Structures are given as C-alpha cells and as structure tokens.
C-alpha cells in the first residue's frame, strides 16, 4: 500500500510544495529505550492550500520531481505552530555550533 | 580471429541506415505541418499530420519505434495541431 | 592409527588392571600382579598429590586407552553425546560400546578388542550378512553379527569360541554359539558395565 505519514508543515516558501516534517518513535536495538527520530518529506500542494503549522497526513505518491514523492493525503489540524518553534529554534541554535 | 559477429555486425548499419531515415522523415513531416499549424492552412496542415502518423506507425511495425513511443509522437503530434489551430481554425479535413 | 604400542605400561601408570590382551591379564605373570607401580625410572618413588586436572586427565585415557581409540574419535562421540539428548554420560558410553570391534570382543570373539579390530578390520566378521572391515561401525540395536562363513573354518575363532559356549554374555547381548552368529540387543546403562571409570570426571575434563 501507499504509506501514510502524519507530519507537520515547516516550509511554504517553495511554490506548490510544502515541507512535511514526519516524526517517529522506536526502541533502541541495544538499549531498549524508546528513541525519537524525525525526517522531513517534501509534499505536493497543487492548490497551495496547506500552510505553516498544518499537521497533515502524507502518502507515498509517484515521483512528481526529484526528491518529491509524497503528496498531501489530507488535513488533520491547524494552529500547530508550537511544533514549528521546536523546529526553527533548532535550526536557529545551530548558528552557535560552528568555529 | 573471425566470427559470425562480423555477419551480425554488418546487418546493423544497413538496419541502422533504415531506422534513422524514417525517424528523420517523421520529425521532418511531424513538425512540418506544425509550422502550418502556426499559420493554418488547416486543410494542408491536417494533410501532413496524417502522413507523419503513417510513417510513425509504420515504424512501429518494425524495430524502428515502439508502439507507446509512436503513440507518444502521434499523441504529442495531434495535440499540438488543434491547439495551434484553435487560435484561428478551423479544420477543413480530418481528423478528427 | 590407534595406539598399537607397549600396552602393559597403560595398566601400570593407571594403577588398574586393563585386560588389554586376553589370557595373561588373568595370569599371575601380569605387571600389576608383579609391578603395579608406574612404568619408567620413577615408578617406585612415592607419588605426589595429583592435580584436579591431572585426575580428570586420568579417567579419560584410562577409558580412552581401554578401547585404544584416537583422542579425536573420542571427542566426536562425546561431542556427539554431549550434543545428544539426556545424560551425555550414558549415551556416549553406549555410543562407545556400540563400536563393532568392542562388541565383537564383548561377544567373546577375541580376547582383546585389539584382536576384535584386526578380525573386524580383516573383515572376518559380518553383520546382517553384510561384511564389514569397519572397526568404527556404530552398531545399533537389531543388528545380526555373523562371523565370516569364509573364516568359520579358522581355529582361533573356535578356541575363543569354545571358551564361550555357555559363558555369561552381557544383558544387551546374545550368542547363538556354534552358528558363530551373535546379536546386539539394546543400548546399555552405566550399571550394565562397572568399568573402572568415573565418566563424569571425563565430563569435567572436556569442560575446560
């Protein structure tokens, strides 16, 4: 089947495409502990409808372009900007991890 | 030193010869009407377009082209004509 | 191959009687009967505390030398039995006794497995009719062991045969005498042979 992912949108800057950040959990193969891992996918937004903060469900679609293989299956929620913060704050923090 | 491959190899160039020609003629005619499409000349354009179809298809008969391809070159051919002939029109012959 | 060297030295060094030939081992001409002390220049010296290792080393060789089997051939079976179900001891034991040569001697066909092998290795023996010059054949229950009809005319067999007619054979053994055709009934338990062995000690040995 076509894999469905429940990720957040972090970028609307591109035209007709969004950056759906997808987060997943799992145990450690050695230390049992549950361990969070994320991964951004590039969702197709033909109607430029989806917006910043939109939690969405993405489906593995046939290749639209390079790197873009999941369309947006459907909306879930809105106003979810707290997550963005937990994203951008990261990207912003990196500015101090150089030399 | 020598092998039937020498026999095998040669034939190609001959076959090589025959395919490249058809394609060249195709695109030669395939586009030729397209120009007319820009200035149709609807009757005369559709007269060319039909010809390319035959050569195109008739290539699909042999190793020259694959059916889906010919259809593509076919499909992409037709599409262009009307669209061009849209601005102006109107088709005199077929088709269609 | 197998040992095949001076043998009395075995019994001596061990401190026990191993009837490795046949008659003499009963005769008063035996070593242990005469010199039951270690062979070599230092036999009659006061032995000293053998090590826990050295101990476990004994029981082995003792048993191992009893059948005259290469150390290897004596790993396999005990890797056999150890990876074999239940009490590895009994099995391996039954795995050992299940050798042709042995049983052949266990069937009183020859004073020593040494003989047993040779007669065995010389194919003078048969099983289920079949001839077997295989002194390592693992005989199973339900096997018919018959002396070679071609060698039924030998006199040595009969001299050992004769001295067997009604002799007491193992519970897991028969001996349709005359017909020179014994038979192997079952696999024994430790209590079936009271060998001068503590098999577990050999268990402890390879446990290294």
């Amino acid at each position: 089947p076509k894999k469905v992912l429940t990720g957040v949108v972090v970028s609307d800057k591109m035209q007709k495409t969004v950056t759906v950040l997808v987060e997943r959990q799992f145990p450690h193969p050695l230390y049992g502990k549950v361990i969070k891992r994320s991964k951004k996918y590039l969702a197709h937004d033909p109607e430029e409808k989806y917006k910043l903060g939109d939690v969405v469900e993405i489906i593995e679609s046939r290749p639209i372009s390079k790197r873009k293989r999941f369309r947006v299956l459907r909306l879930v929620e809105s106003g979810r900007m707290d997550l963005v913060e937990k994203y951008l704050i990261r990207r912003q923090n990196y500015e101090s991890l150089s030399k | 030193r020598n092998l039937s491959a020498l026999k095998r190899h040669r034939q190609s160039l001959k076959r090589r010869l025959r395919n490249k020609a058809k394609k060249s003629a195709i695109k030669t005619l395939s586009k030729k009407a397209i120009q007319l499409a820009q200035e149709g000349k609807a009757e005369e354009a559709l007269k060319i377009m039909r010809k390319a179809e035959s050569l195109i298809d008739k290539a699909a008969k042999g190793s020259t082209l694959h059916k889906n391809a010919a259809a593509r070159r076919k499909s992409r051919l037709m599409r262009k004509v009307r669209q061009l002939l849209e601005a102006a029109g109107a088709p005199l012959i077929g088709g269609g | 191959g197998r040992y095949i060297g001076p043998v009395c030295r075995l019994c001596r060094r061990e401190g026990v009687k191993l009837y490795l030939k046949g008659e003499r081992c009963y005769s008063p001409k035996c070593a242990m009967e005469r010199r039951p002390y270690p062979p070599g220049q230092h036999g009659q010296k006061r032995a000293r505390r053998p090590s826990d290792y050295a101990v476990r080393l004994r029981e082995k060789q003792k048993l191992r030398r009893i059948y005259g089997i290469s150390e290897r051939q004596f790993r396999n079976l005990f890797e056999e039995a150890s990876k074999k179900k239940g009490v590895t001891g009994s099995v391996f034991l039954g795995l050992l006794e299940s050798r042709l040569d042995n049983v052949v001697y266990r069937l009183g066909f020859a004073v020593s497995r040494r003989q047993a092998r040779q007669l065995v290795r010389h194919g003078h023996i048969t099983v289920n009719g079949r001839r077997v010059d295989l002194p390592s054949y693992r005989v199973r229950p339900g096997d018919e062991i018959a002396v070679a009809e071609k060698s039924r005319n030998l006199e040595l067999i009969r001299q050992n045969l004769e001295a067997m007619k009604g002799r007491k054979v193992g519970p897991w053994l028969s001996l349709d005498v005359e017909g020179m055709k014994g038979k192997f009934l079952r696999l024994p338990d430790r209590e079936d042979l009271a060998l001068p062995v503590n098999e577990q000690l050999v268990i402890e040995f390879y446990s290294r």
């Binding site: 450690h28 230390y31 049992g32 502990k33 361990i35 | - | -």
Partner: protein, 122 residues
C-alpha cells in the same frame, strides 16, 4: 552512565594494536641481512645474543634474533622471519627461521629440531 548517554555516545569498541607491523598482515616476510652481530640484553641478564638486521620486501628493516647456537648468516644472506619478540632485547620484535633460505639449522642438534630447522640423523 545514563542509558540516554549510551544512546548518544554509545561505547567505544577499542581495537587492537598489531605487534608485528613490518609484516603487513602476513605470517612470513623474506628479508636480507644487513648487520650480523651480537647484542647485550638489559638486566638482569648478561651475554652476547645473536641479532640479525634485515630489509624486507615490505620495505622496512628490523632486527631479527637468530635462535640456536652456530649459524651461517652474513651480509646478503637470503632469510625468512617470523613473529616473536625477545623480552630482554629491546629493538628486537621478530624471529628468523633456520633451515630456510641462506640460513641453515643448528648443528648436532637433536631435540625440538623443528623449531631449529635440523633434519633427522640415523
């Protein structure tokens, strides 16, 4: 430490430092002597041990201690070596192999001959 840390930094699978580099992961490398002589050891011993300095197809050049008594080793003598150092002799890490190449075993040697390349008498 925390399981987290073990997740973040894990644990370090410390590897091994080979003790015979001049071999290049090989059991035997041919060489050619360069400085046949004697070498005194560090305490608590005293003597004049039989060393051999050898250049190798591995390009290197290392002292190789000549085992036994009496040999036939001088400059340009084709030789083979083996892994094995000589505790008391710093600067020596490998052994030479008698009865091989321009090296001959020990004379009138009867025991452990294998380790000293010396065939069998009568």
């Amino acid at each position: 430490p925390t399981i987290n840390q073990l997740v973040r930094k894990g644990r370090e699978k410390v590897r091994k430092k080979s003790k015979v580099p001049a071999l290049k992961g090989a059991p035997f490398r041919r060489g050619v002597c360069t400085v046949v002589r004697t070498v005194t050891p560090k305490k608590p011993n005293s003597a004049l041990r039989k060393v051999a300095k050898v250049r190798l197809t591995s390009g290197y050049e290392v002292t190789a201690y000549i085992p036994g008594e009496g040999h036939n080793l001088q400059e340009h003598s084709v030789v083979l070596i083996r892994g094995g150092r000589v505790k008391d002799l710093p600067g020596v890490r490998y052994h030479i192999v008698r009865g091989v190449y321009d090296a001959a075993g020990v004379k009138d040697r009867k025991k452990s001959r294998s380790k000293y390349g010396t065939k069998k008498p009568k």
